[PDB]
Amino acid sequence: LYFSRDAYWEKLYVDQAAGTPLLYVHALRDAPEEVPSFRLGQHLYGTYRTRLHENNWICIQEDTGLLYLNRSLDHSSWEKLSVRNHGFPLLTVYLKVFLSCQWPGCARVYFSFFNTSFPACSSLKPRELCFPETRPSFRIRENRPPGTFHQFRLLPVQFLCPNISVAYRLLGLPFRCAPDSLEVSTRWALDREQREKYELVAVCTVHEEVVMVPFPVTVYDEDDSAPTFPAGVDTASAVVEFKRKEDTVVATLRVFDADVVPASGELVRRYTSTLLPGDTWAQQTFRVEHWPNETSVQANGSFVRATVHDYRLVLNRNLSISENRTMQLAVLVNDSGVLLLHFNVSVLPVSLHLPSTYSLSVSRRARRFAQIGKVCVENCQAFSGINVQYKLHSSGANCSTLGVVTSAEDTSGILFVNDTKALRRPKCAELHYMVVATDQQTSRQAQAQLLVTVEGSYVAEEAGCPLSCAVSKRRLECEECGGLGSPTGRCEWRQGDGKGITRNFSTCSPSTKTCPDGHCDVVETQDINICPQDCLRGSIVGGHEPGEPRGIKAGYGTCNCFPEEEKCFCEP
Amino acid sequence: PVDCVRANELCAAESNCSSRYRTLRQCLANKECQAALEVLQESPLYDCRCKRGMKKELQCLQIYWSIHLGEFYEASPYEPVNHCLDAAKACNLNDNCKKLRSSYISICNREISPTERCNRRKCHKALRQFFDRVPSEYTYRMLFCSCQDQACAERRRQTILPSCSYEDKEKPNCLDLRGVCRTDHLCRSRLADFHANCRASYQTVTSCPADNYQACLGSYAGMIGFDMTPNYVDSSPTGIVVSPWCSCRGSGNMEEECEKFLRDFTENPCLRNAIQAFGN
Ligand SMILES: *[C@@H]1O[C@H](CO)[C@@H](O)[C@H](O)[C@H]1NC(C)=O
Ligand SMILES: *[C@@H]1O[C@H](CO)[C@@H](O)[C@H](O)[C@H]1NC(C)=O
Ligand SMILES: *[C@@H]1O[C@H](CO)[C@@H](O)[C@H](O)[C@H]1NC(C)=O
Ligand SMILES: *[C@@H]1O[C@H](CO)[C@@H](O)[C@H](O)[C@H]1NC(C)=O
Ligand SMILES: *[C@@H]1O[C@H](CO)[C@@H](O)[C@H](O)[C@H]1NC(C)=O
Ligand SMILES: *[C@@H]1O[C@H](CO)[C@@H](O)[C@H](O)[C@H]1NC(C)=O
Ligand SMILES: [Ca+2]
Ligand SMILES: [Ca+2]
Ligand SMILES: [Ca+2]
Ligand SMILES: [Ca+2]
């Protein structure tokens, strides 16, 4: 038992006599034992869940399902009931109907009342003689014994105007309009899994006007579909090799289901994924994430929808390097039909050796905090959740000149000049360092050779030089003076364009590959005089756009910066 | 007309009314409920409203939803009352519109991370503070300005800055977003305010109740700055369809109610005719 709709519609007037039939109802059964009873709610509901009075004018026939008028109407009862609307205009009342307020356990019936009386038969258009204002829309389960769910006629219309010749007509369809009785029935039991929608055109014919009205039919679903693989895939092989992060999607698969019925409120409570136990290392390092998505599939030239569940497999912690294992994981799927999944996971350890000797040089004219070379593992861009730190050990322990800091983006170290005087000495000209590549989580480490040659000559800078490269504004004063961060000893000039506010802003940097890079690395952020145009937290004078954490993202004209006041200027 | 703040004022001035109010509040938050109901149906708390932009609107709504008994429509607790270039120029020549305009822009145009595009709650707070205390001849002129080409429609779409507030990584279910909006006090009251003033009608000639364009426009613009915050769908010059950031997917058997809830924003002749007649 279920109501075919949730809203029936009826127009009322003043002084309609008793015994006037109002409307029909329909309640299609589910089992061959069910008889539709119809009981009425004992309150004339007004607007927004407000009781007005008990029903005392409308009675019902439970057998035919006939709402009709028990008593007559007047102006006095309706002006009485309009008072209790509490500041709202009386436009539509409604009743509640039980059967054995929500569909399908209850059905509310609307009544749109007019303060005027019943107009004449010829004073009404046949569009207002055939069908109501609210075009219907029905709710039908799948795979149920069909019956009668709708009737066409307007009962007070033909009850008060019987002399108007009116016909109704429907156009391999299971639906049918019977002759000599304008009830609508359905031949066979239907399924949404074949087709979900049935829109039709019902034709009313008066004397003379032919009126076409749309007629939608919606089919509802039951859980008639076990979970199904797309094509035979039951397992998924994956290797946890380089990432080892707290959370990375390891394995991914799809499962088809034509059942839609466990919707998003109760979707967690019905489609169950269960990691089968057996090792505590899996339960401390793995989990299964699950969500569906609706897709549209074709059945007989139509487009119905179904659920494609996606099961992915997620890590739980930072896996260390020393893991040298493999497992098979088993997954239960419950579509409350019972499905099993597998995952061959292989967690392979990582070698941490380096090339043994990093032969390189450095010019003598360089200044403090100038980048030279890069120390890194053979797989630089493979590490995700493993911290690798770099240090130095000078051999003579007397000629300390250089240092290494580690960026955790690439997990790699960058050489920087720490001292000027030790590089300035002709004694410490070829230096031998033990670059030791360490680790934080598990103390596996390695080491390597660093030979560096102090090469070139030394020339003093100018008399009025500032301490940073970006103080200069023109091109000549940039390269004829030396700032801090450059390993060349002089500052470099990059020249932009006249295309307005661009990223290509003309400036003076220490290195044209490092300072206007758009990234503030570990080297530049040590002391804020090196690269102010990538690492400042300050104010900008001129049309520009600042960087996303910090810095100048785009400028106009020439851009110089005073890092002593955290101020920058941009002007052609 | 007694608002709920003064209704609580007259409620706290009496002993029986306060007793039945706190009794029903301990009931909600048999016979104890029904006696309190049949007493408090004559209270000044019964049928108390609130105001738009009033001081302590939150307490008024928390009092009003406290007496409410526990559904597509609900009762509104309120008083039932180049072109876009010129709109922005008319804003920037006044001082009150300029300050709050630059306030919500300089808040909502601040990217934090490469992942987090903007801060959500501060942007919504700035947009609410903009659309509460600005005279409505400035808000409606900038949000509703008639266009003929694509660039005007793009400026009109970018006016509430949808890159931070409107769009998200996904389009969730509209029914879930309705449940989230009806969990909160303010969003549920603004949604009931929109439902009471912007339904379609078969009797009135403009399909709007009381033929009131102003109440439907105020009920529209009062939803800005919440999770159910609508905007345009594209940069169409003439095609004007507003929508919240959701869709009909994931609906299950609740598809028809989701479609009917979405047709309030997508296919409302009342709201579209109100926008068109305001544009004339
Ligand atoms: C679901 O599938 C559609 C297909 O176009 C896609 O756009 C959407 O991102 C998918 N959503 C999820 C959560 O997978
Ligand atoms: C991992 O274990 C296997 C077991 O035979 C061994 O052969 C292999 O050398 C181990 N991995 C490393 C990096 O030592
Ligand atoms: C699936 O869930 C239902 C609901 O609790 C339960 O009765 C059934 O036993 C479950 N399936 C399995 C294989 O346990
Ligand atoms: C997963 O491991 C099992 C264990 O023998 C094996 O039979 C199966 O073929 C493996 N899966 C794949 C895709 O090779
Ligand atoms: C995992 O490693 C990352 C790498 O930096 C680290 O930031 C994070 O705190 C680690 N988390 C845990 C739970 O170990
Ligand atoms: C650079 O030199 C200073 C002073 O000699 C010292 O404190 C600092 O630790 C050095 N840098 C590194 C990375 O060792
Ligand atoms: Ca079926
Ligand atoms: Ca299923
Ligand atoms: Ca199904
Ligand atoms: Ca840089």
mmCIF file with all atom_site columns, C-alpha atoms in Angstrom, chain A residues 426-531:
data_model
loop_
_atom_site.group_PDB
_atom_site.id
_atom_site.type_symbol
_atom_site.label_atom_id
_atom_site.label_alt_id
_atom_site.label_comp_id
_atom_site.label_asym_id
_atom_site.label_entity_id
_atom_site.label_seq_id
_atom_site.pdbx_PDB_ins_code
_atom_site.Cartn_x
_atom_site.Cartn_y
_atom_site.Cartn_z
_atom_site.occupancy
_atom_site.B_iso_or_equiv
_atom_site.pdbx_formal_charge
_atom_site.auth_seq_id
_atom_site.auth_comp_id
_atom_site.auth_asym_id
_atom_site.auth_atom_id
_atom_site.pdbx_PDB_model_num
ATOM 1   C CA . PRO A 1 426 ? 95.708 31.625 0.103   1.00 0.00 ? 426 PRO A CA 1
ATOM 2   C CA . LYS A 1 427 ? 96.366 28.770 2.548   1.00 0.00 ? 427 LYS A CA 1
ATOM 3   C CA . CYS A 1 428 ? 92.906 27.158 2.498   1.00 0.00 ? 428 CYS A CA 1
ATOM 4   C CA . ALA A 1 429 ? 92.725 26.996 -1.292  1.00 0.00 ? 429 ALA A CA 1
ATOM 5   C CA . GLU A 1 430 ? 91.754 23.339 -1.887  1.00 0.00 ? 430 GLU A CA 1
ATOM 6   C CA . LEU A 1 431 ? 89.379 22.062 0.764   1.00 0.00 ? 431 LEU A CA 1
ATOM 7   C CA . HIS A 1 432 ? 88.241 18.514 1.518   1.00 0.00 ? 432 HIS A CA 1
ATOM 8   C CA . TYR A 1 433 ? 84.930 17.988 3.317   1.00 0.00 ? 433 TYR A CA 1
ATOM 9   C CA . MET A 1 434 ? 83.111 14.862 4.462   1.00 0.00 ? 434 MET A CA 1
ATOM 10  C CA . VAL A 1 435 ? 79.523 15.392 3.338   1.00 0.00 ? 435 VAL A CA 1
ATOM 11  C CA . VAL A 1 436 ? 77.493 13.132 5.619   1.00 0.00 ? 436 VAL A CA 1
ATOM 12  C CA . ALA A 1 437 ? 73.937 12.380 4.510   1.00 0.00 ? 437 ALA A CA 1
ATOM 13  C CA . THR A 1 438 ? 71.988 11.623 7.685   1.00 0.00 ? 438 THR A CA 1
ATOM 14  C CA . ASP A 1 439 ? 68.417 10.646 8.557   1.00 0.00 ? 439 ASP A CA 1
ATOM 15  C CA . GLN A 1 440 ? 65.910 11.343 11.322  1.00 0.00 ? 440 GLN A CA 1
ATOM 16  C CA . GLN A 1 441 ? 63.554 8.372  11.705  1.00 0.00 ? 441 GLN A CA 1
ATOM 17  C CA . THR A 1 442 ? 65.880 5.391  11.237  1.00 0.00 ? 442 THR A CA 1
ATOM 18  C CA . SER A 1 443 ? 69.550 6.246  11.598  1.00 0.00 ? 443 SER A CA 1
ATOM 19  C CA . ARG A 1 444 ? 70.780 4.701  8.334   1.00 0.00 ? 444 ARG A CA 1
ATOM 20  C CA . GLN A 1 445 ? 73.239 7.184  6.858   1.00 0.00 ? 445 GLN A CA 1
ATOM 21  C CA . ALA A 1 446 ? 76.035 7.580  4.333   1.00 0.00 ? 446 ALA A CA 1
ATOM 22  C CA . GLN A 1 447 ? 78.916 9.889  3.485   1.00 0.00 ? 447 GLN A CA 1
ATOM 23  C CA . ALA A 1 448 ? 80.825 11.280 0.524   1.00 0.00 ? 448 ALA A CA 1
ATOM 24  C CA . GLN A 1 449 ? 83.735 13.445 -0.617  1.00 0.00 ? 449 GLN A CA 1
ATOM 25  C CA . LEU A 1 450 ? 83.723 17.194 -1.300  1.00 0.00 ? 450 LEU A CA 1
ATOM 26  C CA . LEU A 1 451 ? 86.701 18.762 -3.066  1.00 0.00 ? 451 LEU A CA 1
ATOM 27  C CA . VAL A 1 452 ? 86.489 22.502 -3.665  1.00 0.00 ? 452 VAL A CA 1
ATOM 28  C CA . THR A 1 453 ? 89.042 24.799 -5.308  1.00 0.00 ? 453 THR A CA 1
ATOM 29  C CA . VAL A 1 454 ? 89.423 28.476 -4.402  1.00 0.00 ? 454 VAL A CA 1
ATOM 30  C CA . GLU A 1 455 ? 90.003 29.937 -7.854  1.00 0.00 ? 455 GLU A CA 1
ATOM 31  C CA . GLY A 1 456 ? 90.444 33.394 -9.336  1.00 0.00 ? 456 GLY A CA 1
ATOM 32  C CA . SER A 1 457 ? 91.558 36.796 -8.085  1.00 0.00 ? 457 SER A CA 1
ATOM 33  C CA . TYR A 1 458 ? 90.136 39.394 -5.702  1.00 0.00 ? 458 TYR A CA 1
ATOM 34  C CA . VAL A 1 459 ? 89.110 42.957 -6.558  1.00 0.00 ? 459 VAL A CA 1
ATOM 35  C CA . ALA A 1 460 ? 87.731 45.447 -4.041  1.00 0.00 ? 460 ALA A CA 1
ATOM 36  C CA . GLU A 1 461 ? 84.226 46.849 -4.484  1.00 0.00 ? 461 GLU A CA 1
ATOM 37  C CA . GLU A 1 462 ? 83.283 50.499 -4.855  1.00 0.00 ? 462 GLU A CA 1
ATOM 38  C CA . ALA A 1 463 ? 83.273 53.179 -2.170  1.00 0.00 ? 463 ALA A CA 1
ATOM 39  C CA . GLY A 1 464 ? 79.538 53.853 -1.936  1.00 0.00 ? 464 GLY A CA 1
ATOM 40  C CA . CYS A 1 465 ? 78.207 50.350 -2.203  1.00 0.00 ? 465 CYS A CA 1
ATOM 41  C CA . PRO A 1 466 ? 75.179 49.217 -0.232  1.00 0.00 ? 466 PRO A CA 1
ATOM 42  C CA . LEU A 1 467 ? 74.861 45.764 1.278   1.00 0.00 ? 467 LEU A CA 1
ATOM 43  C CA . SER A 1 468 ? 72.148 44.299 -0.986  1.00 0.00 ? 468 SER A CA 1
ATOM 44  C CA . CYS A 1 469 ? 71.876 44.071 -4.764  1.00 0.00 ? 469 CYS A CA 1
ATOM 45  C CA . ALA A 1 470 ? 68.334 45.440 -4.905  1.00 0.00 ? 470 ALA A CA 1
ATOM 46  C CA . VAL A 1 471 ? 69.277 48.940 -3.721  1.00 0.00 ? 471 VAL A CA 1
ATOM 47  C CA . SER A 1 472 ? 70.338 49.926 -7.240  1.00 0.00 ? 472 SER A CA 1
ATOM 48  C CA . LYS A 1 473 ? 67.733 51.236 -9.659  1.00 0.00 ? 473 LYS A CA 1
ATOM 49  C CA . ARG A 1 474 ? 69.417 51.644 -13.057 1.00 0.00 ? 474 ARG A CA 1
ATOM 50  C CA . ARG A 1 475 ? 71.329 48.967 -14.937 1.00 0.00 ? 475 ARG A CA 1
ATOM 51  C CA . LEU A 1 476 ? 74.885 50.319 -14.677 1.00 0.00 ? 476 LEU A CA 1
ATOM 52  C CA . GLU A 1 477 ? 74.945 50.800 -10.900 1.00 0.00 ? 477 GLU A CA 1
ATOM 53  C CA . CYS A 1 478 ? 73.645 47.240 -10.428 1.00 0.00 ? 478 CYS A CA 1
ATOM 54  C CA . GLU A 1 479 ? 76.547 45.478 -12.151 1.00 0.00 ? 479 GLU A CA 1
ATOM 55  C CA . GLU A 1 480 ? 79.247 47.980 -11.100 1.00 0.00 ? 480 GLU A CA 1
ATOM 56  C CA . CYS A 1 481 ? 78.604 47.083 -7.457  1.00 0.00 ? 481 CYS A CA 1
ATOM 57  C CA . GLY A 1 482 ? 78.484 43.837 -5.517  1.00 0.00 ? 482 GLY A CA 1
ATOM 58  C CA . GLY A 1 483 ? 75.759 42.865 -3.086  1.00 0.00 ? 483 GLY A CA 1
ATOM 59  C CA . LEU A 1 484 ? 75.555 39.926 -0.719  1.00 0.00 ? 484 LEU A CA 1
ATOM 60  C CA . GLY A 1 485 ? 74.041 36.814 -2.238  1.00 0.00 ? 485 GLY A CA 1
ATOM 61  C CA . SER A 1 486 ? 75.884 36.512 -5.523  1.00 0.00 ? 486 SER A CA 1
ATOM 62  C CA . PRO A 1 487 ? 78.697 33.961 -5.956  1.00 0.00 ? 487 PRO A CA 1
ATOM 63  C CA . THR A 1 488 ? 79.980 36.021 -8.884  1.00 0.00 ? 488 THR A CA 1
ATOM 64  C CA . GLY A 1 489 ? 80.876 38.968 -6.645  1.00 0.00 ? 489 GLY A CA 1
ATOM 65  C CA . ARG A 1 490 ? 78.797 41.339 -8.769  1.00 0.00 ? 490 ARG A CA 1
ATOM 66  C CA . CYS A 1 491 ? 75.059 41.792 -9.006  1.00 0.00 ? 491 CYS A CA 1
ATOM 67  C CA . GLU A 1 492 ? 73.097 40.691 -12.066 1.00 0.00 ? 492 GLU A CA 1
ATOM 68  C CA . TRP A 1 493 ? 70.507 42.733 -13.964 1.00 0.00 ? 493 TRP A CA 1
ATOM 69  C CA . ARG A 1 494 ? 67.438 41.194 -15.560 1.00 0.00 ? 494 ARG A CA 1
ATOM 70  C CA . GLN A 1 495 ? 65.407 43.408 -17.879 1.00 0.00 ? 495 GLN A CA 1
ATOM 71  C CA . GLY A 1 496 ? 61.662 43.050 -18.320 1.00 0.00 ? 496 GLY A CA 1
ATOM 72  C CA . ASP A 1 497 ? 59.009 44.329 -20.713 1.00 0.00 ? 497 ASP A CA 1
ATOM 73  C CA . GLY A 1 498 ? 56.566 47.181 -21.140 1.00 0.00 ? 498 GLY A CA 1
ATOM 74  C CA . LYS A 1 499 ? 53.439 45.019 -20.918 1.00 0.00 ? 499 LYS A CA 1
ATOM 75  C CA . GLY A 1 500 ? 51.985 46.576 -17.770 1.00 0.00 ? 500 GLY A CA 1
ATOM 76  C CA . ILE A 1 501 ? 51.842 44.736 -14.451 1.00 0.00 ? 501 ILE A CA 1
ATOM 77  C CA . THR A 1 502 ? 53.791 41.588 -15.330 1.00 0.00 ? 502 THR A CA 1
ATOM 78  C CA . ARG A 1 503 ? 55.877 38.938 -13.657 1.00 0.00 ? 503 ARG A CA 1
ATOM 79  C CA . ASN A 1 504 ? 58.640 40.111 -16.016 1.00 0.00 ? 504 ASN A CA 1
ATOM 80  C CA . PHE A 1 505 ? 59.654 43.155 -13.985 1.00 0.00 ? 505 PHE A CA 1
ATOM 81  C CA . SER A 1 506 ? 63.090 44.637 -14.602 1.00 0.00 ? 506 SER A CA 1
ATOM 82  C CA . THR A 1 507 ? 65.285 44.400 -11.518 1.00 0.00 ? 507 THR A CA 1
ATOM 83  C CA . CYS A 1 508 ? 68.726 43.861 -10.015 1.00 0.00 ? 508 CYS A CA 1
ATOM 84  C CA . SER A 1 509 ? 69.206 40.495 -8.321  1.00 0.00 ? 509 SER A CA 1
ATOM 85  C CA . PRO A 1 510 ? 72.177 38.537 -7.012  1.00 0.00 ? 510 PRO A CA 1
ATOM 86  C CA . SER A 1 511 ? 71.363 35.581 -9.290  1.00 0.00 ? 511 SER A CA 1
ATOM 87  C CA . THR A 1 512 ? 68.835 35.690 -12.119 1.00 0.00 ? 512 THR A CA 1
ATOM 88  C CA . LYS A 1 513 ? 68.027 32.022 -11.460 1.00 0.00 ? 513 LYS A CA 1
ATOM 89  C CA . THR A 1 514 ? 67.557 32.293 -7.726  1.00 0.00 ? 514 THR A CA 1
ATOM 90  C CA . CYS A 1 515 ? 66.311 35.637 -6.420  1.00 0.00 ? 515 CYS A CA 1
ATOM 91  C CA . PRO A 1 516 ? 63.293 36.501 -8.743  1.00 0.00 ? 516 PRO A CA 1
ATOM 92  C CA . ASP A 1 517 ? 62.373 32.798 -8.769  1.00 0.00 ? 517 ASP A CA 1
ATOM 93  C CA . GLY A 1 518 ? 58.989 33.199 -7.127  1.00 0.00 ? 518 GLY A CA 1
ATOM 94  C CA . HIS A 1 519 ? 60.114 30.920 -4.292  1.00 0.00 ? 519 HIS A CA 1
ATOM 95  C CA . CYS A 1 520 ? 61.719 31.836 -0.968  1.00 0.00 ? 520 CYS A CA 1
ATOM 96  C CA . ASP A 1 521 ? 64.045 28.913 -0.261  1.00 0.00 ? 521 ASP A CA 1
ATOM 97  C CA . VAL A 1 522 ? 66.063 28.061 2.845   1.00 0.00 ? 522 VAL A CA 1
ATOM 98  C CA . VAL A 1 523 ? 69.143 30.007 1.706   1.00 0.00 ? 523 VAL A CA 1
ATOM 99  C CA . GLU A 1 524 ? 67.456 33.380 1.113   1.00 0.00 ? 524 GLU A CA 1
ATOM 100 C CA . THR A 1 525 ? 65.458 33.252 4.365   1.00 0.00 ? 525 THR A CA 1
ATOM 101 C CA . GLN A 1 526 ? 68.534 33.071 6.619   1.00 0.00 ? 526 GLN A CA 1
ATOM 102 C CA . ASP A 1 527 ? 69.263 36.803 6.780   1.00 0.00 ? 527 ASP A CA 1
ATOM 103 C CA . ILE A 1 528 ? 66.923 39.288 5.105   1.00 0.00 ? 528 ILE A CA 1
ATOM 104 C CA . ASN A 1 529 ? 69.329 41.245 2.986   1.00 0.00 ? 529 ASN A CA 1
ATOM 105 C CA . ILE A 1 530 ? 69.957 38.590 0.336   1.00 0.00 ? 530 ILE A CA 1
ATOM 106 C CA . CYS A 1 531 ? 66.802 38.560 -1.773  1.00 0.00 ? 531 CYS A CA 1
#
